[PDB]
Ligand binder design. Structure first.
Ligand SMILES: COc1cccc(C(=O)N[C@@H]2[C@@H](O)[C@H](O[C@@H]3O[C@H](CO)[C@H](O)[C@H](O)[C@H]3O)[C@@H](CO)O[C@H]2NC(C)=O)c1
Length: 138
């Protein structure tokens, strides 16, 4: 068990073929989960499942530059469930982050922050018990 919020260093930033894997369990009365890939204070890629946004479940993705959020990208496919174990895998490709949950492809997020080598930490937060967070090169 890792304490949330958890910061996972990404030494030398991200690069294509890097695979980040997060294993956890959603708390039974969850409101949100967030993964934040950071370039100093900027958030290159925010991945944010919301369990009760006006009584709908939605995943919101965005980028924060100079303390300002950008244009949201929303996905209504929602593979998380309160109480239940999950696996999130984020594969860095040359033009996007590719996200799979529980082994099924979920979404892609085009790189808006293009200095991939400067995206040097991942913060993991929200209503989860965190079991493991790791990376490897495929
Ligand atoms: C496209 O259809 C819909 C449906 C329901 C809500 C929204 C929406 O745009 N919500 C964002 C919210 O998603 C946004 O919340 C922020 O959204 C960020 C990601 O964009 C991040 O998760 C922040 O932590 C969170 O506070 C707040 C504050 O920036 O602004 C809100 N926007 C407005 C206009 O109030 C859109």
């Amino acid at each position: 068990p890792l304490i949330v919020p958890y910061n996972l260093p990404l030494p030398g930033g991200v690069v294509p073929r890097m695979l980040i894997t997060i294993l956890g369990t959603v708390k039974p009365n969850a409101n949100r989960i967030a993964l934040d890939f950071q370039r100093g204070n900027d958030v290159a890629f925010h991945f944010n499942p919301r369990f009760n946004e006006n009584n709908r479940r939605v995943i919101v993705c965005n980028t924060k530059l100079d303390n300002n959020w950008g244009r949201e990208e929303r996905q209504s496919v929602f593979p998380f469930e309160s109480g239940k174990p999950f696996k999130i895998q984020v594969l860095v490709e040359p033009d996007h982050f590719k996200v799979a949950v529980n082994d099924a492809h979920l979404l892609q997020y085009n790189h808006r922050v293009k200095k991939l080598n400067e995206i040097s930490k991942l913060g993991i937060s929200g209503d989860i018990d965190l079991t493991s967070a790791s990376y490897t090169m495929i």
